[PDB]
Write an enzyme that holds these catalytic residues in place. Structure first.
Site, PDB file in Angstrom:
ATOM      1  N   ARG A  87     104.110  -3.531  20.299  1.00 53.49           N
ATOM      2  CA  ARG A  87     103.237  -3.876  19.184  1.00 53.49           C
ATOM      3  C   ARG A  87     101.894  -4.358  19.702  1.00 53.49           C
ATOM      4  O   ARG A  87     101.817  -5.389  20.361  1.00 53.49           O
ATOM      5  CB  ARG A  87     103.870  -4.957  18.299  1.00 53.49           C
ATOM      6  N   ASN A  98     108.739 -14.729  18.814  1.00 56.98           N
ATOM      7  CA  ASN A  98     110.025 -15.223  18.343  1.00 56.98           C
ATOM      8  C   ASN A  98     110.386 -14.781  16.922  1.00 56.98           C
ATOM      9  O   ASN A  98     109.638 -14.052  16.276  1.00 56.98           O
ATOM     10  CB  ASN A  98     110.114 -16.761  18.489  1.00 56.98           C
ATOM     11  N   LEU A 131      98.861 -19.626  14.772  1.00 57.62           N
ATOM     12  CA  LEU A 131     100.122 -19.512  15.493  1.00 57.62           C
ATOM     13  C   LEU A 131     100.424 -20.803  16.251  1.00 57.62           C
ATOM     14  O   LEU A 131     101.495 -20.946  16.831  1.00 57.62           O
ATOM     15  CB  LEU A 131     100.080 -18.318  16.455  1.00 57.62           C
ATOM     16  N   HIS A 157     104.380 -20.768  18.073  1.00 60.34           N
ATOM     17  CA  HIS A 157     104.650 -19.997  19.285  1.00 60.34           C
ATOM     18  C   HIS A 157     104.280 -20.818  20.514  1.00 60.34           C
ATOM     19  O   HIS A 157     103.210 -21.427  20.562  1.00 60.34           O
ATOM     20  CB  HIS A 157     103.883 -18.675  19.255  1.00 60.34           C
TER      21      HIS A 157
HETATM   22  C1  1P3 Z   1     106.875 -12.567  15.341  1.00 59.26           C
HETATM   23  C2  1P3 Z   1     106.130 -12.741  16.661  1.00 59.26           C
HETATM   24  O1  1P3 Z   1     106.655 -13.434  17.525  1.00 59.26           O
HETATM   25  N1  1P3 Z   1     104.918 -12.181  16.800  1.00 59.26           N
HETATM   26  C3  1P3 Z   1     104.109 -12.363  18.004  1.00 59.26           C
HETATM   27  C4  1P3 Z   1     102.730 -12.901  17.640  1.00 59.26           C
HETATM   28  C5  1P3 Z   1     102.071 -12.070  16.550  1.00 59.26           C
HETATM   29  C6  1P3 Z   1     102.982 -11.925  15.337  1.00 59.26           C
HETATM   30  C7  1P3 Z   1     102.349 -11.008  14.323  1.00 59.26           C
HETATM   31  C8  1P3 Z   1     104.321 -11.356  15.753  1.00 59.26           C
END
Ligand code: 1P3
Length: 165
Positions: free
Chosen positions: A55, A102, A122, A126
């Site tokens: 991704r 995560n 985030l 994270h």
């Molecule tokens: C769910 C997840 O850990 N991620 C990584 C950081 C960016 C998010 C869109 C997706």
């Protein structure tokens, strides 16, 4: 102390792109830094080598680390399957930040992401544990093979990886 340094040799459909090196903040997040370091060297018998960045969202981040299922649903840590969020001391301050992907609180495995921009939303969600030291131009190059929803136009893989320092 001495924060370890690891590298990734990135490829696009096998064709060599370049090397990205990361400093791992073992001084602030030792358990999270060790997981990434060990997975980069493959010392546990499994790791990032051969895995892909499944991704990639331009202006946001490059996500990878799923060496088990190879599609963003798998991956595993060196402490079993998943481990707890160590701490949220560090923030997603800008491009180059290395953080844990995560599926909610305390579900850290092997998946991670490299920010290409400041992603403060985030913060606290994270675990940030490192930063790109060299090869940001290569991360910017990877970003060009991504899309808005994240699907990549070509297979972006970690051809080789290991420890530098
Ligand atoms: C769910 C997840 O850990 N991620 C990584 C950081 C960016 C998010 C869109 C997706």
């Amino acid at each position: 102390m001495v924060n370890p340094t690891v590298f990734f040799d990135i490829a696009v459909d096998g064709e060599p792109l370049g090397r990205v090196s990361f400093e791992l903040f073992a001084d602030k997040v030792p358990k999270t830094a060790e997981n990434f370091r060990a997975l980069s060297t493959g010392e546990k018998g499994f790791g990032y080598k051969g895995s892909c960045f499944h991704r990639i969202i331009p202006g946001f981040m490059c996500q990878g680390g799923d060496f088990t299922r190879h599609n963003g649903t798998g991956g595993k840590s060196i402490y079993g399957e998943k481990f707890e969020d160590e701490n949220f001391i560090l923030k997603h301050t800008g491009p180059g930040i290395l953080s844990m992907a995560n599926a909610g609180p305390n579900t850290n495995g092997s998946q991670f992401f490299i920010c290409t921009a400041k992603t403060e939303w985030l913060d606290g969600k994270h675990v940030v544990f490192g930063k790109v030291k060299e090869g940001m131009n290569i991360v910017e190059a990877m970003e060009r093979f991504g899309s808005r929803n994240g699907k990549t136009s070509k297979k972006i893989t970690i051809a080789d990886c290991g420890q530098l320092e």
